[PDB]
Structure 1
Amino acid sequence: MQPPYIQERLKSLNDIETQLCSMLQEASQVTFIFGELKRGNESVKPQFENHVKQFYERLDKSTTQLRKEIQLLDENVGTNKKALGQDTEKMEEQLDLLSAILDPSKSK
């Protein structure tokens, strides 16, 4: 499996696009609510401020976190290799098989 650092990096990226999807959804609801606000019912007027504020705060911190990720790219620089040992490990397992062949009491 990959080293953990890459794991939380990909988790943060996934959070980033989920936040972008949430921003698009909230844009959909604010566009929806503005229609009836133009229609002329004032009951949903208080919800408009909350929706706008949450939309803007969702737009800002997502870009901020992505900026942090791109910054991490800046200092992460400088921080078949398996083949060099690959034959060796193959060697090992083959002899292990011979051991299983060599002992008739373990072939069950």
Structure 2
Amino acid sequence: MQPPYIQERLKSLNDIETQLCSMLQEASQVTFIFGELKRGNESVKPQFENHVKQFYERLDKSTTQLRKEIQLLDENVGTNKKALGQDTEKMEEQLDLLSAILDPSKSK
């Protein structure tokens, strides 16, 4: 499996696009609510401020976190290799098989 650092990096990226999807959804609801606000019912007027504020705060911190990720790219620089040992490990397992062949009491 990959080293953990890459794991939380990909988790943060996934959070980033989920936040973008949430921003698009909230844009959909604010566009929806503005229609009836133009229609002329004032009951949903208080919800408009909350929706706008949450939309803007969702737009800002997502870009901020993505900026942090791109910054991490800046200092992460400088921080078949398996083949060099690959034959060796193959060697090992083959002899292990011979051991299983060599002992008739373990072939069950």
TM-score (norm 2): 1.00
Distance in 2 (alpha carbons) for counterparts of 1:102 and 1:70: 57
1:83 counterpart residue number: 83
Structure 1 gap ranges (5+):
none
Q: Counterparts of 2:15 and 2:37 in 1: how far apart (Å)?
A: 32
Aligned residue number for residue 22 of structure 1: 22
TM-aligned CA deviation for residue 16 of structure 1: 0.0
**Structure-2 separation of matches of 1:17 and 1:101:** 54
| Structure 1 residue 6: Cα displacement | 0.0
Counterpart Cα distance in 2 of 1:50 and 1:82: 55
Aligned counterparts of 2:66 and 2:76: Cα–Cα separation in 1: 15
CA deviation digits over 1:52-78, x for unaligned, max 9? 000000000000000000000000000
**Aligned partner of residue 78 in structure 1, secondary structure:** coil
Corresponding pairs, count: 108
1:72-100 per-residue CA deviation (whole Å, 9 max, x = no partner) reads 00000000000000000000000000000
Identity %: 100
SS in 1 for 2:52: helix
**Aligned counterparts of 2:23 and 2:52: Cα–Cα separation in 1:** 11
Task: Indicate the SS of the match to 2:80.
Answer: coil
| Counterpart Cα distance in 2 of 1:56 and 1:75 | 30
Q: Which runs of 4+ in 1 moved over 6 A?
A: none
Q: Secondary structure at the match of 1:105?
A: helix
Partner residue in 2 for 1:71: 71
RMSD between aligned residues = 0.0
Alignment partners' CA distance in 1, 2:12 and 2:24? 19
